[PDB]
Design a protein around this ligand. Structure first.
Ligand SMILES: C[C@@H]1O[C@@H](O[C@H]2[C@H](O)[C@H](O)[C@H](C)O[C@@H]2N=[N+]=N)[C@@H](O)[C@H](O)[C@@H]1O
Ligand SMILES: C[C@@H]1O[C@@H](O[C@H]2[C@H](O)[C@H](O)[C@H](C)O[C@@H]2N=[N+]=N)[C@@H](O)[C@H](O)[C@@H]1O
Ligand SMILES: C[C@@H]1O[C@@H](O[C@H]2[C@H](O)[C@H](O)[C@H](C)O[C@@H]2N=[N+]=N)[C@@H](O)[C@H](O)[C@@H]1O
Lengths: 435, 435, 435
């Protein structure tokens, strides 16, 4: 009755679970002691000059790394705000999560249209948000005096959502003293010890035994000395939980989905923040965040290209989700409540994309015979010409109302008439439906 | 003056020590905290349906593994007898060995005809029966408050017997949470950690330094990550104790004897219990155990085929040896006191085996020129025809009395006349002696 | 801005730092708890019968190893002086360094002409002379209650000298119980554990972070399991401290200089004691030590052949340097104050060596155009014929005074007249200077 064996050839048998492929949209949570200072220079996105990136790091979870660079703006801010005698470690005692309600979060992610949730159980600073027995630097012994991963796991599952775990396998600044100043530094500033490979193995195993997560989401690769451990760990995981899944940031020959942070025959997932960082950043306002309209557009783009969206939320150290983020999540969810059928459970079509003469981008998703045509915007006119597309027969109709639409092939293109009556009832995106 | 070097080519120089080849018969002791419950379903022997084996495990030392399977009869028995809130670990506090006398055991094994003794210093549950400094889960800090391995080592040696050690290198359930339900589970449900490879190395070394055992008997393979350590450990062992020996369950290119648990040019050893399990089992009665006659027959069969017999004894948690087991050991010893010369110090002949027309099995052993003919039973008649055997000359005579016997070759066969007078003085086995 | 990458091909880019090549002469310090007994049989030098070497070990730092051999003279001396119930470990409590002044040492090494200093931070007995967090068996928690490595680092640097560290990577008798009796024993009597490879990595790293030494001087190889760690550790070291250096006793493809303990195109270094041992030995008198004259002769010989001299000092457990050693260091320094220009900052010539008809050895060093001719002794005569050497033109003159000397080529040889007036002002060595 155990199906999976501990070797890569055997672990290939485990394909991406249907629930994940159908889920389309999940929530990432970067929440730690780094949330307490919750500070970073909001420079930009990947592809900002990577030479200065670590010196002007827009990722607020990297606070400790930035704090270790004395030249950095983070060091100035830390000394000015907390003093030079305040070690990063001490944020664990200020990290109280006093106003945290896990069910409010789970409900928020549900209403946002999210189908799975993945919190940082341990990020690069090595602080663990569960009562792990392999370090005392955890949320049960320090600040919150509470198993944050567990109580969130109960909340997300009770809300009917899948629960995955993020674990920083590659980096752990409890095991190094120097900061990362350039990308090349990452090739040698790592724990490197056999001890650490055991520590990571033991910890992810502990996560598996305690919470049996639906996703194992690893960050920054797996320690070279422990890479062979993963075939034992995957087999173990899958045999306990066949519908479990695993990302592609381990550095070994197996993964269930690829990740991207900037039509394919494999399942993948785009991850990004609502803002510029993953962890809470005070300095971010609306100018640094995507709008409800842009989130929708992104989500539709990714789904049409075969991917999920893993949108990150960065809560404050008190356990509340900033109104700027909550606002955008509820907006996305309001579009999903309305157009979900065109997203959830869909498949890629023969092409991802097309455009009008007016310049409006178009994205396609499939649901057996039903082909959704999702416009990235609402054309201000009845006559709509789609460039380079033909339809041989059948019935094209307006998705939201169900009203039949007149259409015909004009050479390479396809003309469709959509009455203003119908275009005016749509929100953010005109959606059509063919057969 | 150090002969052995730490590489497999060099360690091949160490052949099986003469004492072991000459010893023929040794005692295994499976004794732990698992002895306290001392319970298992007495299903059968290896080759019972291996699909159900772990679910209906007849090995009482596997109690914890069986306890971890909630479906199992062991789980029912544990809850009913000790409660669900009684963790396996707590048997260490009930394991008092209150009536243990190590010299009574040593004397018992001596009278049984045993030439060496091998107790479980640490089995799969990871409880160590010596004051090891690498774990507190040992017999010095817990229940017995006593170095059981050491005090037994003194007793066995004072009785004039060789003392080996059993160590579970392959399995240690202090390092895993899941049970073994199928054989395939063993390929991934292991400690797996570098930590554990160090732990096993350090522990066997500690055994070597403290007790310098005559046999290193490993169980369930050696951790893959520590396999290279063994060439250092063997060289070390042999250089301290050249007459030391090592079994073949390490998974590396060197061994002094092979083990079997169901005419060869290498030394080997058959191991089995007096009953169906190795550890004490309450549920076993005489119907589940070999008789004195069967033990003799086994011992003779194995010795004629070049092997030793490692017969297992399973003591109670109070440190007493059940009368059913003691009875059979004393019976074997009574046959050995009588026919020892035909077993101890012997060698394989040109063939192991033969049979009479009446169907009685025959086994041969050699002692230079003296060829022992051991019948598996006592024929009820003077005229005895051995199928397919000839003797060219010399003098065949009755072993116990020394009386010359008349014989001749009849075609393929050999006829021997053994007067009822002599057949009636033998016990269990007619033994003859040729030249 | 990080130049070095963690692979051997990339680490070859780091050549020996100029300061080291120019330094020529450094001081080794073997100082530990072994200094307290400070005892060894002064047998001889390497190339003494190596069969008896460990049994009659002249290296006083090996006391514990010798103590573990019950046959040895060290065992007799220990029992007689301290009792059989006095474990080697307890010397850590007698090792008080009560009269230690680090600035007196630094000043002593400065006046001796030494340009760098390398103390044993941890030798084979595993006692660390700094407040390491990876073992309590250190100088901060035990005897001296003081960071000896650190306070010496401050003293040497304030005196203007470079400070390196010696670390015993290969051997650590905190991790083994058996002694080394023969050289072959070293191939298996080692820590061997993954644990230990981590321990050594972590400890040298800690040295790098705390003191950023100018030399990493490893002893007895690097643990096989940790050898790959060194490319990460070297890159790390070099990127923090490009002028750092590394010796060749790691057993990996990279080193900055070779070591010797008995004309090459690579930089190397001869290491030896003033006496026969490295650690303090009571039993050594002047008969076992080199004279000021011999030290000079050695230093000149090594420098002419492209090497540095790493002369060892062995202090008492009270932190004082024996007068026999201090005397010889001050003597060497008095010659260096006088002839330094001919040694410091020099380069190898087209040949190392030559000789007179009278049998006096000669050594050459180069300083651009200035070619120093250093006689190993002072000829008692004006006419000096150097065998097999010609000079085409230029001006040969007496180094100390600057007085021009008459000379000519006579066949293969070169005759030089040096007035008694000038030969009588030299000390230990006649030095000439050509162009
Ligand atoms: C989700 C995100 O992952 C990591 O970010 C990394 C980028 O995604 C990218 O792979 C580059 C190469 O490295 C980035 N690391 N940084 N900064 C985490 O580091 C990050 O904290 C966050 O968890
Ligand atoms: C002596 C005996 O050894 C192990 O038993 C194993 C069998 O001998 C056989 O090798 C199969 C493949 O695995 C058995 N394990 N089980 N159950 C120990 O497991 C057993 O406890 C005992 O020590
Ligand atoms: C400096 C010196 O190094 C080691 O001595 C070793 C010799 O230099 C040589 O390499 C031989 C092969 O092994 C010697 N070891 N011994 N004895 C150290 O062992 C010694 O203590 C000292 O540090």
């Amino acid at each position: 009755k155990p199906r999976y064996k501990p070797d890569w050839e055997s672990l290939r048998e485990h394909t991406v679970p249907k629930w994940f492929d159908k889920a389309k949209f999940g929530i990432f949570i970067h929440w730690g002691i780094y949330s307490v200072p919750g500070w970073a220079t909001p420079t930009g996105e990947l592809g900002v000059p990577m030479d200065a990136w670590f010196f002007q790091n827009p990722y607020a979870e990297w606070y400790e790394n930035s704090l270790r660079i004395k030249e950095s703006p983070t060091w100035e801010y830390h000394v000015k705000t907390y003093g030079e005698n305040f070690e990063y470690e001490k944020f664990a005692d200020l990290f109280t999560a006093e106003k945290w309600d896990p069910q409010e979060w789970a409900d928020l992610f549900k209403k946002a249209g999210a189908k799975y949730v993945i919190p940082t159980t341990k990020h690069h600073d090595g602080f663990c948000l569960w009562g792990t027995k392999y370090t005392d630097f955890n949320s049960v012994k320090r600040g919150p005096k509470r198993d944050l991963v567990g109580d969130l796991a109960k909340a997300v599952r009770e809300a009917g959502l899948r629960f995955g775990v993020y674990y920083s396998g590659g980096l752990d600044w409890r095991f190094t003293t120097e900061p990362i100043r350039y990308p090349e530094d990452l090739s040698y500033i790592r724990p490197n010890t056999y001890e650490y490979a055991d520590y990571a193995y033991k910890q992810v195993m502990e996560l598996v035994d305690l919470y049996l997560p639906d996703v194992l989401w690893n960050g920054m690769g797996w320690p070279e000395k422990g890479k062979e451990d993963l075939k034992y760990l995957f087999a173990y995981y899958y045999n306990k939980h066949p519908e479990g899944s695993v990302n592609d940031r381990w550095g070994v020959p197996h993964w269930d989905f690829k990740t991207a942070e900037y039509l394919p025959g494999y399942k993948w997932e785009f991850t990004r923040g609502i803002g510029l960082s993953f962890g809470y950043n005070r300095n971010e306002g609306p100018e640094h965040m995507l709008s409800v309209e842009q989130l929708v557009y992104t989500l539709v783009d990714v789904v049409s290209k075969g991917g999920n969206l893993l949108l990150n939320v960065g809560p404050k150290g008190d356990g509340t989700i900033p109104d700027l983020q909550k606002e955008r999540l509820l907006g996305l969810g309001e579009w999903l409540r309305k157009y979900g059928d065109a997203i959830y459970g869909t498949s890629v079509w023969e092409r991802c994309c097309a455009k009008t003469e007016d310049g409006t981008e178009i994205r396609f998703t499939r649901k057996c015979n039903r082909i959704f045509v999702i416009f990235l915007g609402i054309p201000t006119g009845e006559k709509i010409v789609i460039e380079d597309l033909n339809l041989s027969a059948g019935t094209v109709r307006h998705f939201l109302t169900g009203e039949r639409l007149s259409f015909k092939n004009v050479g390479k293109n396809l003309e469709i008439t959509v009455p203003k009556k119908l275009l005016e009832t749509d929100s953010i995106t005109l959606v059509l439906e063919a057969v």
